[PDB]
Nucleic acid binder design. Structure first.
Lengths: 231, 56, 329, 493, 34, 64, 86, 59
RNA sequence: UGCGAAAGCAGUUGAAGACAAGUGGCUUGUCGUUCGUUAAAAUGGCCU
């Protein structure tokens, strides 16, 4: 059965994400509402539904932390200078991120974000980062709970898309790599568990107008790991 | 038939020491950080950060 | 249609066990019917096509027996979260109904076979099958103490069965469709109700004669009877509840419902009741508030009016009033 | 943390003769039109129903003007003598005009060529003709025959009722606005008679003694009516036969009245009065018929009217003068593929459970002095004060904000000759006013405290200080003589 | 205050006033589901 | 209350906090709260402190 | 006014500082590149330091200091560093 | 950009599945897509406002 | 500082010790020092 058949959408469905554990599907579009559906085979019903006024949404993501796997945030954002974060509690407590901590000129719209995990690498403490794709070549990485700007990674060209790769190192330590593509086809990989420094820079063979990069086969941002040893 | 009582609280009363800069805030968060334990000069207030009410 | 595939109360109506699908796999959860005395952990069926066909509360480590569709009765403790023991027949046939009396579990098969298991010994005691009963989908033990004689088996047509002779001793005219509820009321009566009809009939288990017919005003999903036959509450297809008060007295051959309860929200949206529970003066109704999470309500059903409309508070357009901010933002 | 409080504009204690809401509303009737008629405008009526046209009765023609272009849409010129009264029926469908030969002629409105019927009333001139306001098929015409007549417009041969009884020159009718059997007529002997039409009709049920010869009688409530004649107007409770207000706020005789109800206004009701000396005034019936606004015109005003209660468009006040001209003052009032792509932007949360709202409201734009005081650019805030296009209260409030807030001296530190001349050249103008002169005093005192050497060097602000000295000399003569007047009426307590 | 009491304010601001089977299953489930 | 990004020396401000900050500290495990003591020194006759934590996300006064 | 440090191989930015208020006309460094001094039309001289062992092992300049010494501009800056001259 | 433009390419073999989607799959103008982490289950959202749902029976 | 009214009316401004600079002393100046008396400045300014 069509998942949003129970409660129709009033716009084109711009983003779509499953929950990492629960049977929930979050849809959202330019009608500035976001809907969660308990999906099954027969009767995909609507769990809850939140209409953010004056804020059409373009990307919406279930985030679930690695430490306790008990937060269940929803980060959502559109063509705005803010990004909402709903804390799932089954009223609804949402917060708004609207401060680039000195970096507002290079981030004029919170549309293209991605959420990922990051490790402190002196403690074994992970925390979520949101990653915002900005104007020049910039990716502004900031904390997913405090909203503090952690670091920024600039590629040379027109930034078009990016993805997050993880690689394990030892027992309980992994490393986060940001993979960002020019429009022209040249790809930067930034190690960002340290300071956001480039470790590899390669070039796509062929390809001249590049719109979308993705990784897969392990833990992406859309197949997320529930436990840190499962990365 | 008249009786005196003290019924309502007072000042929060942090560390009133000299020679301690920084940590003079003796209020604590819980470990399951849902309620905030502040002393007063008359009592220990325990507020709750979710509902902003005093719960104990 | 309802996401809750199977659901049943414990005796005394204190907990509700319910099987719902969760993104192509069945999951079995238990909720307390009153919090004043969430439970966020489920039993997960790990196969995409293994599913629960029936479930029964045992009575004292508390457990559920879940009759699956691969010839197995799983026995699952609820305080822990594992199937403690896996009864199996020799076959792969789905099992249509189970029951137990004391420690003696009985079950029916899709090949119309009867199996008997012992919960104290974890063993298949008996396996048999009887003639002219060929589409069985309900059994009910007629209670006679620790003796577990006289099963009562339905196939659209109820048949009383002596197990020492493995033979049929009475034959009741059932329905025109498969029987969906078949429950013993007193030591001389049993109620039965079929799939897709709104007529229960109470039969006399000693003669075969139908005492009375009970008429819901919508197709009956589940029923509960209070433990002393004085009240029967059925829940129907349109999400309503109908209480027949004292149905076993002299509205002479067929009786209508005495009380009818439905739930609406503050809006006008009618939520459906599934699977209520009744006892002496106390009635506990269940619905789903969000998509699959059950909410309950206790009611003194003897002092409510006849046409009762429970009102629940449910989010429809409410402005998200944050506790850390006044109304002016 | 809060938002920043806005800079509050310095308001002084209010002076006398402030702008009332009534006179603000009645003062936005502007853009006067003067249309020269052939003779004195005697009557003017409005269309009731689509209340958007008005008929002006000049001599020997009646012109319907539109209430959106103010030009003559239609005109009625086939009268033999001076046409006197012209009013629309309550349905606004046809137009009656009494003529100086005693021939009431009723046309249909918006068609001057189809004269519908010509009632031949008295041989004397017929001076007032109006339909019933409740009934549709009866027309009341009074004439210089000292007798009014009610005519059924089906049987237009004999009058269906003949209201006599008045001794001299009946010039006005009126109908009572809830009881349709009740006709109040007014004549040049005073004595508003009024008649129950179910009775004989040759005797009034009672009579109201306006002492002057009345010029008009209108009905405000179903109970109270207002008669103007002579220098005053009086109001009369009709259930108790008794006068209860009289306003005589004119010099010459009040020629006409009319009344408005429920229209979009601070005034819930309004009676305006036109009075042969140039003045038309508006009186508010809810606070005891007190006058709230007035217009003065270029000659003796003979008749006036306003747009009716349901005007819904361009709203008019018209006054026709005895000089032979007409004065109108009005108040006025991408792709289907792209839209399918950008569909949802007008939804606003109807079927949705929770609806979150944290879009902050966009406040008024900050002026340059306010954002400079915010940015702590205090000398730039003083510079932004003394631009030419600044309001006087705005220069005063940024001076007062720099005075209270920080330092006059900080705002004045880096200055010289060319950058002090705006301040002192404004202080010349601000020293005259009472509300500014304390701030002007301490600002001039500080600038001569810390620029006493530039006084010596530059001669082209020496002369500015001398002009300021003569200004304070004039102002101190004024502030001394005000204390003398204060004493000389303290003597008279 | 306007209902026959008198409030007073201490110098350290304390306001004072002068006036006129299943049970163990329930317990262990509320433990194990929290 | 300013918070200095020590990489680029970049301040983020919170400007009108009804009292001078006599103590400030991060509080959570991830640092999601700031707790502050505000001395409110317009009256010189008493030392009256306001205790104000606030969530670090949108810098709103959670539980003053 | 921004001063940027770019990794030569990979030809890409490591970190950007928003230091001056107007143009940065001239900038220079010392021998062992523990400091970078910079100046321009807003007439302050900024110093960016990497002298800490953690700064050298992390490749992280910090905006250390800032001095206002000139009257109008700085159009030229240079550095000399020897055993008896720095 | 156009209607029904969705392909599922099998890999490591790098070969597009040739039996789905067909000409009668109501994919629409595919403006989002999502995979379930456990069930083996596609959600495909189009410009009409419809999430269509499919289950891959390998999982 | 005290009494006052928002005007005003009476009172002032010592000592010890340590340290710093300059030329063990002498001079000058300070004090997260004590006793007694009712007693201007580090280019450094306010969020989305």
């Amino acid at each position: 059965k069509d998942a949003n058949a129970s409660h129709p959408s009033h716009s084109a469905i711009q983003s779509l994400s499953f929950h990492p554990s629960k049977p929930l599907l979050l849809t959202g579009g330019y009608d500035k509402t976001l809907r969660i559906y308990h999906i099954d085979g027969k009767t995909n019903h609507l769990v809850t539904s939140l209409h953010l006024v004056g804020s059409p949404i373009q990307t919406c993501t279930f985030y679930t932390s690695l430490s306790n796997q008990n937060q269940q945030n929803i980060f959502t954002a559109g063509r705005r200078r803010y990004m909402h974060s709903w804390d799932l509690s089954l009223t609804a407590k949402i917060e708004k991120f609207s401060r680039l901590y000195g970096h507002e000129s290079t981030q004029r719209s919170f549309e293209n974000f991605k959420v990922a995990h990051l490790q402190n690498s002196q403690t074994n403490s992970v925390h979520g980062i949101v990653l915002l794709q900005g104007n020049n070549g910039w990716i502004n990485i900031l904390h997913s709970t405090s909203g503090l700007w952690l670091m920024g990674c600039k590629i040379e060209g027109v930034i078009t898309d990016f993805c997050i790769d993880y690689q394990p190192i030892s027992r309980g330590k992994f490393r986060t790599i940001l993979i960002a593509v020019n429009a022209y086809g040249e790809v930067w990989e930034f190690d960002l568990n340290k300071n956001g420094h480039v470790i590899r820079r390669w070039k796509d063979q062929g390809g001249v107008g590049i719109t979308k990069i993705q990784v897969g086969g392990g833990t992406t941002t859309t197949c997320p790991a529930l436990q840190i040893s499962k990365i | 038939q008249y009786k005196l009582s003290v019924v309502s609280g007072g000042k929060p009363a942090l560390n009133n020491l000299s020679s301690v800069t920084g940590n003079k805030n003796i209020a604590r968060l819980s470990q399951d950080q849902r309620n905030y334990i502040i002393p007063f000069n008359n009592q220990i207030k325990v507020y709750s950060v979710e509902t902003r009410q005093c719960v104990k | 249609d309802s996401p809750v595939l199977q659901s049943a109360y414990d005796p005394s109506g204190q907990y509700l066990c319910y099987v719902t699908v969760a993104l192509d796999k069945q999951r079995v959860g238990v909720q307390p019917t009153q919090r004043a005395t969430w439970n966020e952990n489920f039993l997960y069926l790990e196969d995409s096509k293994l599913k629960v066909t029936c479930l029964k509360w045992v009575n004292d480590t508390v457990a559920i027996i879940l009759g699956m569709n691969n010839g197995e009765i799983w026995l699952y403790s609820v305080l822990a979260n594992e199937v403690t023991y896996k009864f199996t027949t020799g076959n792969s046939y789905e099992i249509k109904d189970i029951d137990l009396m004391g420690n003696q579990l009985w079950c029916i098969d899709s090949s119309d076979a009867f199996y008997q298991f012992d919960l104290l010994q974890f063993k298949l005691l008996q396996h048999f099958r009887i003639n002219n009963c060929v589409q069985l989908n309900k059994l009910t033990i007629v209670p006679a103490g620790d003796s577990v004689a006289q099963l009562l088996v339905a196939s659209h047509s109820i048949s009383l069965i002596d197990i020492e002779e493995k033979k049929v001793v009475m034959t009741f005219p059932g329905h025109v469709s498969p029987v969906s509820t078949l429950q013993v009321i007193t030591n001389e009566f049993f109620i039965s109700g079929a799939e897709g009809d709104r007529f229960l009939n109470v039969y006399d288990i000693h003669s075969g004669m139908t005492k009375c017919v009970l008429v819901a005003e919508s197709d009956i999903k589940e029923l509960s009877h209070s433990g002393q036959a004085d009240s029967i509450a059925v829940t129907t297809e349109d999400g309503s509840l109908e209480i027949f008060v004292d149905p076993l007295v002299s509205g002479n051959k067929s009786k209508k419902s005495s009380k009818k309860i439905q739930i609406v929200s503050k809006d006008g949206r009618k939520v459906p009741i599934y699977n209520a529970f009744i006892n002496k003066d106390l009635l506990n109704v269940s619905w789903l508030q969000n998509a699959t999470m059950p909410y309950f309500k206790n009611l003194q059903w003897r002092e409510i009016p006849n046409e009762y409309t429970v009102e629940i508070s449910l989010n429809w357009n409410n402005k998200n009033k944050s506790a850390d901010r006044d109304l002016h933002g | 943390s809060t938002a920043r409080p806005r800079i509050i504009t310095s308001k002084a204690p209010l002076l006398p003769q402030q702008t009332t809401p009534e006179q603000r509303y009645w003062r936005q009737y502007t853009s006067a039109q003067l249309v020269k008629e052939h003779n004195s405008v005697t009557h003017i009526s409005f269309n009731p129903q689509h209340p958007h046209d008005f008929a002006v009765t000049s001599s020997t023609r009646v012109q319907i003007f539109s209430s959106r272009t103010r030009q003559v849409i239609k005109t009625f010129s086939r009268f033999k003598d001076v046409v006197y009264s012209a009013s629309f029926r309550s349905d606004g469908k046809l137009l009656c005009a009494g003529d100086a030969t005693g021939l009431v002629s009723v046309y249909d409105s918006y068609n001057p060529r189809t004269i519908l019927l010509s009632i031949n009333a008295s041989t004397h001139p017929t001076h007032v003709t109006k339909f019933h306001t409740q009934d549709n098929k009866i027309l009341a015409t009074a004439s210089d025959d000292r007798v009014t007549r009610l005519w059924d417009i089906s049987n237009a041969y004999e009058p269906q009722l003949e209201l006599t009884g008045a001794t001299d020159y009946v010039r006005t009718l009126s109908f009572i606005p809830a009881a349709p059997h009740l006709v109040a007529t007014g004549s040049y002997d005073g004595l508003i008679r009024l008649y129950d039409t179910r009775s004989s009709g040759s005797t009034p049920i009672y009579s109201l003694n306006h002492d002057q010869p009345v010029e008009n009688v209108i009905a405000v409530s179903p109970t109270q009516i207002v008669s103007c004649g002579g220098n005053n107007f009086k109001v009369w409770d009709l259930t108790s036969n008794k006068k209860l207000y009289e306003r005589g706020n004119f010099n010459k005789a009040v020629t006409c009245l009319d009344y408005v109800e429920n229209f979009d206004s601070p005034m819930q009701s309004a009676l305006i009065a036109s009075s042969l000396d140039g003045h038309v005034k508006v009186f508010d019936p809810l606070d005891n018929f007190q006058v709230k606004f007035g217009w003065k015109f270029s000659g003796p005003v003979l008749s006036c009217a306003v747009s009716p209660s349901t005007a819904q468009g361009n709203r008019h006040l018209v006054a026709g003068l005895s000089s032979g001209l007409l004065a109108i003052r009005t108040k006025k009032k991408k792709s289907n593929n792209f839209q399918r792509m950008m569909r949802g932007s007008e939804y606003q949360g109807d079927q949705e459970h929770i609806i979150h709202n944290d879009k902050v409201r966009s406040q008024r734009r900050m002026r340059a002095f306010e954002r400079n005081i915010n940015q702590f650019k205090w000398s730039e805030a003083l510079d932004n004060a003394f631009v030419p296009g600044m309001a006087k209260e705005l220069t005063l409030t940024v001076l007062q904000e720099l005075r209270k807030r920080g330092k006059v001296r900080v705002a004045l530190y880096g200055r010289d000759e060319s950058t002090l001349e705006p301040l002192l050249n404004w202080c010349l103008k601000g020293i005259e006013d009472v509300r500014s002169a304390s701030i002007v005093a301490d600002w001039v005192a500080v600038v001569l405290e810390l620029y006493g050497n530039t006084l010596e060097s530059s001669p082209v602000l020496q002369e500015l200080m001398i002009d300021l000295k003569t200004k304070v000399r004039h102002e101190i003569h004024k502030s001394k003589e005000a204390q003398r007047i204060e004493g000389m009426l303290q003597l008279l307590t | 205050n306007y209902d026959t009491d008198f409030i007073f304010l201490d110098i350290e601001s304390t306001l004072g006033v002068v006036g006129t089977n299943s049970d163990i299953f329930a317990e262990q489930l509320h433990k194990l589901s929290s | 209350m300013s918070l200095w990004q020590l990489e680029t020396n970049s301040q983020q401000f919170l400007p009108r906090l009804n009292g001078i900050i006599i103590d400030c500290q991060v509080l959570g495990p991830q640092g999601n709260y700031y707790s502050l003591i505000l001395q409110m020194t317009e009256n010189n006759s008493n030392s009256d402190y306001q205790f104000l934590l606030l969530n670090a996300s949108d810098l709103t006064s959670k539980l003053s | 006014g921004s001063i940027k440090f770019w990794d030569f191989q990979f030809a890409t930015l490591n970190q950007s500082f928003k230091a001056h208020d107007a143009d940065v006309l001239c900038l220079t460094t010392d021998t062992d590149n523990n400091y970078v001094f910079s100046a321009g039309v807003d007439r302050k001289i900024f110093q960016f330091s990497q002298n800490t062992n953690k700064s050298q092992k992390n490749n992280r300049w910090v905006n250390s200091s800032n001095r206002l010494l000139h009257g109008n501009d700085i159009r030229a800056i240079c550095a000399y560093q020897s055993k008896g001259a720095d | 950009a156009v209607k029904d433009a969705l392909r599922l390419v099998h890999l490591p073999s790098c070969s597009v599945f040739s039996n789905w989607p067909t000409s009668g799959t109501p994919l629409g103008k595919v403006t989002s897509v999502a995979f379930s982490p456990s069930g083996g289950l596609l959600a495909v959202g189009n410009e009409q406002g419809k999430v269509r749902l499919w289950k891959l029976n390998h999982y």
